[PDB]
Design a binder for these strands. Structure first.
Lengths: 63, 49, 79
RNA sequence: AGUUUAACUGGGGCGGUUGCCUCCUAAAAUGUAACGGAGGCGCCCAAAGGUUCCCUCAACCUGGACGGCAAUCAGGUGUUGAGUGUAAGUGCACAAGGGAGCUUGACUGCGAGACGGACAUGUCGAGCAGGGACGAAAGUCGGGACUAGUGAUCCGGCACCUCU
RNA sequence: UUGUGCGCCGAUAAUGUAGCGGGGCUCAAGCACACCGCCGAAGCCGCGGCAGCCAACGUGUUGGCUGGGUAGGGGAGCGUCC
RNA sequence: GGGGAUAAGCUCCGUGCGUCGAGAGGGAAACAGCCCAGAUCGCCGGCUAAGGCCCCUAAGCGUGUGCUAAGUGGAAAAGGAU
RNA sequence: UCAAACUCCGUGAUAGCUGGUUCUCCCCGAAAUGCAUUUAGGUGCAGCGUCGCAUGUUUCUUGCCGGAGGUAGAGCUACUGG
RNA sequence: UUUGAAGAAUGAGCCUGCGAGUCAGGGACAUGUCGCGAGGUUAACCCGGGUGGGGUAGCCGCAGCGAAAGCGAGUCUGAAUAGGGCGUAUCCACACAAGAGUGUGUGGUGUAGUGGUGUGUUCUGGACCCGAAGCGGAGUGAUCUACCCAUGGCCAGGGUGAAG
RNA sequence: GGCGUCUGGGGGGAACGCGGGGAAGUGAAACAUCUCAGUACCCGUAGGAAGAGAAAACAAAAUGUGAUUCCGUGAGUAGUGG
């Protein structure tokens, strides 16, 4: 039997050229009238995932 | 709701640009504000929708 | 018979983050404070929440002026 | 017929609590628990925001038509005991407190460097560019003296885009 | 009268002395201050065997430090069958 | 330090504090958490730590100067007492 | 055998639960904390162990030097209260 | 199994047999060893009484960025040579700017992967072994017991004395 | 409808086929959507195999394939999903 890649993790994370794992930030979907532009500006773009959960994420994406 | 969220639209190109709140009971009328219109590239009067 | 107390906020981790005699880059936060206990001096800028930071690299040095605590930065010498 | 009907709890129940902000416990860095001791919030302001300029209270003493402890006036003393939209603390008289003129930076694109953290969040940010406000100029302005006034993701609505 | 070192009374439970471990001790074997020895452990030393880490040189010896251990991680082995 | 009655072998915290947990050996009569000290193995050798040296019990009914009459030593309070 | 009978089958039902898991030596050796939790006797991340690689004393101890506090203490015509 | 048991906490009467991390997959990650090496390798299938020979369809590596159109040692965002994000294996020399932490250029060095297979964890499977109360599908049961239906049988002896 | 007469059926079988009906334990750390699964079981039916089969098919501007069935890839990808 093959190993089924996790559907949710496959739709949220990415692999870059070197093998990094990136992710998007939260708190940017709704209820953002009162969030100043500084908060929203720092909340966009892909960020390398923390090394705390880098072990679990590799297991999900690769298997 | 006393302070309902309102949005501001550029008077020239009618782009809904900003969103603030105001006291409807204190200012029942619409809001006259000049703001930076990004696509126009120059400050244009902004109308609350 | 019950207690009406027991509510508390998180601990905000204020204090002096960088102490005197330390080398700081530009922008490093020196003190995290609520009021102006420490006041900005030379090459020290005040943040929005009265957080102090550094505009120029150098070594911290606490000082006083007109009976007010101040924080300064001395321009450490290039090798 | 298939199921759901929470947890903490000096056994369980009844009672009370569940998030955020401030103070003491907290042992002079940061942090630190208990059904320990006290309070507040789920807002408000189109000016109570930005900027330029000017000013200094509270209290007491003396004298004044109503007017008296206290209303407005004059004089003197008066370094902070008044006041700061709102709880407490840290601040502020050089004012962040009182008043006046103009105005919308309560911006767009970004952001070196940091604080704090299991992770997710959260916070400060000099400076560059565009286009502005006040100011003679230096300059200040990416909301409010600061810290609370809030809800991840999925799903869906509206407007714009040189995408398919 | 004051300050001190030792004491007395206050004192008082239910199987059997029973609030020194026992015997016993004031001819202290009790208390305080100085002095002298000794006994005491798997501690330290002596003599010998083994192992791990490292170093010195060498074609594996020598030397130095180290070797309690549950959950648990690593290395190397005995025994059985085909 | 908080709660409790400034009670608990109580409960909740802090501590480049300890030990037990996960730890043998000597002492405290017996006695995880106290005191001395971290067990590589052997020896019918030696020196010590805490603790002891009248007999049980190893080594002192040790030396000098005193104090106690209560077996104090070998449990205790306000207070009483030539 | 009855608050829903018996037998076979799904079926080796599923249990954040109790029990059990077998030969040896050598080296190293923890935790009972933090955050979150339909969560508190479970689990995820972090903290503490071991093995490999990389970097080398950056770790640690002591002296000296530059720092900021607001406890112990103390003080009150220096504030708020008693 | 516990903070702690010789424990008056649990289990074992004794002996001998039997009784618990295994297997599948071109699975995933990591680490050894072997082959080839900018390449490595076949699957299905065909030919051989064999373990051998053939089999290029595919897979991994060989260029990245971006939602995508696309561009390409660059690319995205952006009005921007204006900063930032990801990337150009890494190292060495030399120049040029900074000493807001170094950066940019030239030159050299040159890039290592992939197939078996051993081991450790892991995925789907009952997945280290033993153990429920109960849940569904199809059937067996009223010879015991509850009720009913058809047809039979039994009730010693002695009193009281209704209607008529 | 009744007669008379000829030919057929009926039942069994381990697996494989085809067309119908169709759960629950379980996973979701609860659970109803969903999964378990069109699985277990039941029904009707043949055969030595059955079913499918000769384009009202793919395809994408190539002057391409050319009935069905069965293996390997495509691929745990495009997608779908409280």
């Amino acid at each position: 039997p093959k190993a089924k890649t996790h559907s949710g993790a496959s739709k949220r994370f990415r692999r870059t050229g070197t093998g990094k794992i990136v992710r998007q930030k939260a708190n940017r979907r709704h209820l953002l009238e009162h969030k100043p532009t500084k908060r929203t500006r720092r909340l966009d773009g892909r960020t390398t995932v923390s090394a705390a959960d880098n072990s679990r994420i590799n297991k999900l994406l690769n298997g | 709701d006393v302070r309902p969220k309102i949005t501001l639209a550029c008077e020239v190109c009618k782009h809904r640009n900003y969103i603030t709140k105001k006291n409807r009971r204190n200012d029942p009328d619409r809001l006259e504000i000049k703001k930076f219109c990004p696509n126009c590239g120059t400050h244009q009067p902004h109308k609350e929708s | 018979s019950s207690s009406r107390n027991g509510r508390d906020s998180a601990a905000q981790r204020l204090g002096v983050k960088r102490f005197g005699g330390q080398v700081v880059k530009a922008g490093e936060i020196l003190v995290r404070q609520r009021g102006t206990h420490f006041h900005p001096g030379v090459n020290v800028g005040r943040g929005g929440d009265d957080t102090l930071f550094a505009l120029a690299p150098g070594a911290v040095e606490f000082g006083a002026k007109r009976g007010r605590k101040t924080v300064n930065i001395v321009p450490v010498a290039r090798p």
